[PDB]
Amino acid sequence: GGGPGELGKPVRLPKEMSDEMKKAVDDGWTKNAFNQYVSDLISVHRTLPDPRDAWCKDEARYLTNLPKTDVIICFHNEAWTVLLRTVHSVLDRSPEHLIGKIILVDDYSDMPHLKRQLEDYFAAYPKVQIIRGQKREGLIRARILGANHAKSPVLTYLDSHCECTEGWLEPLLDRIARNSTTVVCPVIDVISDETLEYHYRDSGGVNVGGFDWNLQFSWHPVPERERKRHNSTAEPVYSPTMAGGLFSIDREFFDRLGTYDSGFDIWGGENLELSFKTWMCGGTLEIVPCSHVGHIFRKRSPYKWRSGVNVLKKNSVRLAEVWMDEYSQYYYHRIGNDKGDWGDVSDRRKLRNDLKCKSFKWYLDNIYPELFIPGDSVAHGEIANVPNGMCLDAKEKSEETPVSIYECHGQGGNQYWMLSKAGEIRRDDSCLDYAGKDVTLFGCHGGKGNQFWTYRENTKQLHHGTSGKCLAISESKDKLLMEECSASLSRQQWTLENYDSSKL
Ligand SMILES: *[C@@H]1O[C@H](CO)[C@@H](O)[C@H](O)[C@H]1NC(C)=O
């Protein structure tokens, strides 16, 4: 008798709703970018299925005396039932002796339900502590504020729209108990933004964290190298990076690593900073398949991924400048080597030096050898039509986007391409494709075919394998097309920045 959404089952509203209900549902989406109305129907003690593999219950054995953790949850104008459901999932599914304090860090909310109402509600839970930021500061500063209030040996960071699952905590703390330089993440499961349905997979499908050369986090499957280290896919696996929202760390080790770079602005990337310094300054980073936490997955694209201005640049530049050695150049190519103002980084350099950290080359060689380095490609940079000043140009959404041509601007971004050994014209994981209609950009599949191109050096033509046609610019200079190949047609002549035959 768990009510709507019990055992993580979906809650669906009726097709027909009164106008007052419709206003309530729409209001919920406006405020939260998820369906707050259905969350409000679902118990804040909503039961969930046990998502763990049999290995996690029958074969995994954890140290008897685990260190206590504080759980730090930062929020800004979170919905009442969603914030409460997070906190109760922590209280109800974690052994009491393993929780120090649940520290709720209010990053300057203005909604009334988060003020006195929130204090009164948790007054009867002595483990819950509310910290009020004095101005709006963003996630990094709120998390550091939380860490400074924390007294337990381990910090566990969650966000405000999570649901812990059965047995989530012990596997994380066991790794830190064995070696306090180990940083750990639960497997992050999907809670639907529409129905709040909870979804879990077995440990066979575990993904691990990487990054692309735009310095954005990305997921990849456990590489074969790492799978060969384990007898069961349920064992914790090394991860080059963490997504950042959910992890545990020894409190002193976090401070030793310099927590987060407080010179970052609010637009993220501190997950990558912490990942890099964990591996190259004496620690390890694991994803722990026996530990699941559900997380409300908003399908709506957040502002930072579609901004008209590059809000990601400052933190990416500070990251590259402090931690990436000579490899920073590949990110700088992506932004046209226009680094902007990234502030003062000298204290972070002193931090890295004082910790005697390893090189970024060591990190790439040893932790993330699967990452392809753009300098090893046949060509990288702009792809320019010789007789004029038009460049191959595309908005890269990870969907099929149209590929066109625009005046070369020398700023990277939409005009940055790589020519791979396999004949792909690509940016990150999207490949130039032609199937007889329009030239498009979609996910690289590694099968050549319609994604196979050759640069014909003596004519400077971009020749397409399966069609036998050549990439060209219309004589009105405003449309990209595929046409019959012809030597001497200047409209079919392209130059590829950094083209190097020796690389194929
Ligand atoms: C803990 O892990 C770090 C990083 O792998 C390693 O340098 C250290 O020797 C380990 N400590 C113990 C006691 O195994």
Residue numbers in the entry: 143 to 540, 542 to 647
Tell me what the authors wrote about this structure, in their words:
CG30463 is predicted to encode a ppGalNAcT/PGANT, which is an O-glycosyltransferase responsible for the post-translational addition of the sugar N-acetylgalactosamine (GalNAc) to proteins, a modification typically found on mucins and other secreted and membrane-bound proteins. ppGalNAcTs are type II membrane proteins that belong to the CAZy family GT2731. Comparison of these clones to genomic sequence data revealed that they represent splice variants of exon 8. PGANT9A and PGANT9B adopt the canonical ppGalNAcT tertiary structure where a ~10 amino acid flexible linker connects the N-terminal catalytic domain to the C-terminal lectin domain.
The active site residue Asp 301 is misaligned, and the active site loop is disordered. The variable loop in PGANT9B adopts a similar conformation as the loop in PGANT9A, except that negatively charged residues Glu 538, Glu 541, Glu 542, and Glu 543 are clustered at the region of the loop near the active site to form a negatively charged patch. Another charged region is evident in the electrostatic potential map, where residues including Asp 535 and Glu 550 form a distinct negatively charged patch on the surface of the lectin domain. In agreement with what was seen in cell culture, in vitro enzyme assays revealed that both PGANT9A and PGANT9B are capable of glycosylating the neutral T-rich peptide derived from the T-rich region (PPTQQSTTQPPCTTS), but only PGANT9B was able to efficiently glycosylate the positively charged PTTTK peptide derived from the PTTTK repetitive region (PTTTKPTTTKPTTTK).
